[model samples]
Target: GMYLKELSMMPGVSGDEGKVRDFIKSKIEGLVDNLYTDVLGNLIALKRGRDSSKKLLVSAHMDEVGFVVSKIEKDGKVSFLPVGGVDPRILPGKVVQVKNLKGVIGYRPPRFENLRIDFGFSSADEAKKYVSIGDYVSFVSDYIEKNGRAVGKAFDDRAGCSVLIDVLESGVSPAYDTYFVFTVQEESAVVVEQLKPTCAIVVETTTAGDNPELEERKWATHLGDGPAITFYHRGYVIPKEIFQTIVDTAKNNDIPFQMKRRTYGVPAGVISTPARYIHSPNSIIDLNDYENTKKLIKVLVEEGKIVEVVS
Candidate 1:
C-alpha cells in the first residue's frame, strides 16, 4: 500500500529511469507471475488467471514530465525546456534531482519563504547549478492522510499502479491472461504509439481542476466522484464494444464510475501523429472507479472460463 510519493522519489523522468525500474522489479518480484522490461524501459508483468486464449493488458506510465539540464548559466543558473507536458508554472520551488548527479534544486531558503502563489514564480538564477536540463524534478511532499483523506505528489499513474497491485491481491481471477504494464515515457506520449496492443487499458491521472472558479463540466473529474472511464483520447478511441462492455459491467457490478467521452485532449491536434492533448500532464481517476474497473475485467475473464457452467 505504498503511494506514488515512494515511486516519485526514484527519479524515473523519461529516458533515465534505471533506478525507478530497478525499484519496481524489487517490489513486485514475487507478486507478479511474470516480469520483464521492454526495449523502451516499459516494465511488463503478468498475473495468470484462467488463460482462455485471451491477452489483456493494463498499463500506466512511470515516466514523468520534467526538464533536462540543457544549458548552464554564468551564475550556475539552469535554462532548459520541458521534456513533456510540464507547465513552467509548476517549476519554481519544485524539488528536483539531477541525472546520476546528486544536487538539490531551488535557493537555500530565504527565497522559498518569499515565493508567491502566482504562476509567474521564478527560480533562483543559482538554481540551475543544482538542476540541469536533463535532471528530473518532482514536487516534494510526504504522504499523509488528513481528516480521513490523503494527498501527495505523483499520485496520477502511481495510484493506478497501486490499483493494479490491488487487483492482484483481490483474488478476482478471470479467464483471460491479464498483463500489468508500467509503461515508460507516457508522460511524453511515446510508449502507446510504439507498443500498440490490440486491447489496452491505460489507467492514468490527469489535470482535474476542482477549484471553485470552474464549473462542474470544466473540472475533468473530481478526486473521489469515482474513476474516470475514458472512452477516447488523443491517439486511440476505446473500441465501441469494449467501451460498452466496461460501462455495462460497471453498472452490473454496482461500481461507481464516471464517463469522460469527450477528452480534454485536443481538437485534431498534432505533434504525435495528429493526436490531441499529445502531452497533457496529470489525469485523474477515482481509486474506487479503478476498483470497479478491476471487477469488470475479472468478470469478463471469469465469464469466458465458465463455458461448462453456462451449458
Candidate 2:
C-alpha cells in the first residue's frame, strides 16, 4: 500500500519519468539480480529463478496522462497542453503540481484548446522566476486508503507497479528467471523490442467503465473484480492457452478475477488490476483485486505454471 501510495504521488508524464524511475530503481536495486535503466529510462530489473530457461518479462508502464507547460504569457498566464489523453473537462479549478509549486489550472473554465494555469505572477518575468516552458504539470490528489479501497492519482499503472514491487519483495524465487520492467510511455510498444522475452505479461490498470453514466455493453471491467485478464486488445491478441492458464490459476487458487476484454509478442499478455476512472486525477481500486493480481502473478511465475506459448 505504501509503495502504491508513494509511486502514485510522483509526477511522471510521458517522456519525463526520471522521478518514478529513480524511486523504483532505488527500491529494487538490491532486490533484483540485475537492474538497469534503458536509453528510454525503462526500469528493467532481473531476478534469477530456479531455472533460467525462459525469461518471463513482467511489465507496467510508469507514465501517467498529464499536461506540460507550453506557453508563458506576458501577463503570467500559463498555457499548457495535455501530454496524453487527459480530459480538459477535469481541469477547471483543479490544482496542479508544477515541480513542487502548486498552481491552479483553468480557473477561467476554458476548453481543452485553451487551458491555462496560474501561479499568481503578474508578469512573464515573474513567472519565469518559478516556472518554465516544458515543465511537467501533474494533477494534485491525495493517496488515501479507506474501506478496502484506495483513492489517488496515477493508479492506472501505479497499482501494477505496486504488484510488481510486492512480487520482488515476496521472498519467493520463481520457476523461470523473470524480468520486472517499469516501462515508460506504454500508451507504444517501444520497451519490448530490446528485451525479447520468451513470454511476457503487461500489468496495467484497466479502464474500469462500470460507472452509471456508461452502458453495460461498454464497460471494460468492474472495480470490485479481482484481476482482469486481457482477452483482446487493439493490436496484439492474448493467446487462448495463455488466457486459459491465467483463468485456471485464479480458479484453482480461489482468487477473484475477471476478463479485461487482450494484446503481444514474445507472446505477451495483459493482466490488470481493476481501476475506475483511469487517466484522471483520482482512481479507485479494490484492495482485494490488487492483492489477487499480485497473488496470481506470484504463483504464475512458479515453475511449470504459466508457460510460453511460442517456442
Q: Per-candidate TM vs. native?
A: 0.69, 0.91
Which tens-of-lDDT digit does each residue in 1-311 have in candidate 2? 24988998888888788999999888888789899988767888998888887778888889888888888889888889888876677678888888888888774433665767887888999999899999988888888889998988888788899899888888658788888988886423566677666788788887554343653644467777788888877656567777888888889999998877521445667888987754357878989889999999988887546655555
Over the stretch 171-244, how does candidate 1's per-residue lDDT look in tens digits?
A: 65655666677877632244444433335556665544423244345435545555556665657544455656
TM-score of 1: 0.69
- Candidate 1's C-alpha runs over 4 A off are 8-10, 99-133, 186-198, 210-220, 261-311
- Model 2 clashing-pair count: 4
C-alpha lDDT values of all predictions: 0.52, 0.80
